[PDB]
Structure formats: C-alpha cells, structure tokens
Amino acid sequence: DDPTNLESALIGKPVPKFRLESLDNPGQFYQADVLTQGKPVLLNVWATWCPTCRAEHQYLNQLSAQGIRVVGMNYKDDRQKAISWLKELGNPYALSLFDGDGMLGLDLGVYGAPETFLIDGNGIIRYRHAGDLNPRVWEEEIKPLWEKYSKEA
Numbered sequence: 001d002d003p004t005n006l007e008s009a010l011i012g013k014p015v016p017k018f019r020l021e022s023l024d025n026p027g028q029f030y031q032a033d034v035l036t037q038g039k040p041v042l043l044n045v046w047a048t049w050c051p052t053c054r055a056e057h058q059y060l061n062q063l064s065a066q067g068i069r070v071v072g073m074n075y076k077d078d079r080q081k082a083i084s085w086l087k088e089l090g091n092p093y094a095l096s097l098f099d100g101d102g103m104l105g106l107d108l109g110v111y112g113a114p115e116t117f118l119i120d121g122n123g124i125i126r127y128r129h130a131g132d133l134n135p136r137v138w139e140e141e142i143k144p145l146w147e148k149y150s151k152e153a
Contacts, residue, residue, distance in 0.1 A: 009109040010125045015043075016107035020097040023074050023082055030097060034071065036123030040149040041069045042142075044093075044133070045105060045115040047077040048085050053114045056132035057089045063138065064092035068146065072096025075105045075113055118142060120149040 003011075010016075015035050022028045035041055044060065046053045064070050072093035074082050079098060086096070099105055108117070118127040127145050129137060 006109055006111075007128055007130060009128075011128065013125060014123045015119055015125060016104065018097075018099075018104045018107065020099055020104060023072065023079065023096040023098040024086075024091070024093070025095075030095070032123060034095075035119050036121070038121040039069065039153060040118060040120050040146055041071055041094075043071050043073055043117040043119055045073045045075050045108075045110055045113040046096075047075045047113055048081040049077065050075075050113040052132050054089065056114055056134065057092070059134055059138075060092040061090045063133075069094060073104065073108075074098050074100070075110065076100060076102040116142075118145050118149070121152065 002008075015032050017032045019029055019031050022030060035043060042063075060070065070092050072095060074096045077098075077100065079100065082096070082098070086093075097104065114132065115128065115130050116133050117125055119125050126149065127142065129141065131137075133142075
C-alpha cells in the first residue's frame with residue numbers, strides 16, 4: 001500500500017521551504033525554487049564528517065559530467081572544511097547549500113548521510129536513497145526515474 005517508514009517521508013510532496021546561503025559563493029542565498037526549475041534534479045546530502053561520502057564522490061563527478069543535475073546539501077558541516085573537501089575531490093554540484101544549522105536536513109527527514117533525493121521539475125520529491133550513490137543504484141533505481149521526469153519536458 002503506502003509505505004509508512006521514515007525513508008518514505010515527503011515522497012510525492014514539494015521540497016520543504018528554506019533559505020540557505022551558498023557554500024560555493026558566499027553572499028548568495030537560495031530557496032526551494034532552486035530545486036523547482038522545470039527539470040529534474042538530484043539533491044545530495046553530504047558532509048566532511050560523513051564516513052562513506054568520499055566513497056561516492058567520483059561517481060558523483062561522473063554523473064555530473066554526463067549532464068545529471070546535482071545540488072549539494074552540505075549538512076551541519078564546518079564551512080572551511082567543506083570548501084577544502086570540494087577542492088581536493090572535485091565539485092560535482094550546481095551549488096551546495098550551506099545547511100550549517102541542520103535545519104533543512106531536519107525538514108527533509110534526514111538522519112546522518114550521505115543521502116540522495118530525486119526531485120522532479122515541479123519541486124516534487126519522487127525518490128530517496130540512503131547510502132552511497134553508485135552504478136547499480138543509478139542503473140536499477142534512479143535512472144528510470146530521471147528519464148521518466150525528464151520526458152515530462
């Protein structure tokens with residue numbers, strides 16, 4: 001029927017509202033609208049304290065380079081560390097929101113990381129996977145959803 005588990009929260013509803021500064025370019029702020037752009041996007045919860053986050057990063061670059069749109073959700077992290085991080089490993093993201101308060105994660109039902117949402121063009125959350133992004137997950141679970149909500153263009 002309808003899944004009742006905490007990983008199924010927000011499935012089928014609009015991204016929570018927020019206002020967060022960009023980690024990449026200080027001074028610039030963003031809101032739910034940035035994830036509501038008429039095309040599907042991936043939102044990827046990450047932080048320097050997240051132990052499996054490095055393990056998923058290079059495949060994050062790979063998708064980013066084939067035109068899969070990815071927005072960073074830097075979760076309760078240390079600003080300077082996060083910067084140093086993106087610098088050594090590469091920057092896959094359109095931008096990372098600096099959720100240094102943890103408010104947005106909290107709004108999204110996030111506990112620990114990394115985690116990846118597929119949000120459609122209308123800002124609606126369609127899928128949520130806890131754990132590392134990799135070619136299996138992509139090919140099996142996410143790719144069909146990305147095509148589904150891209151063809152709605």
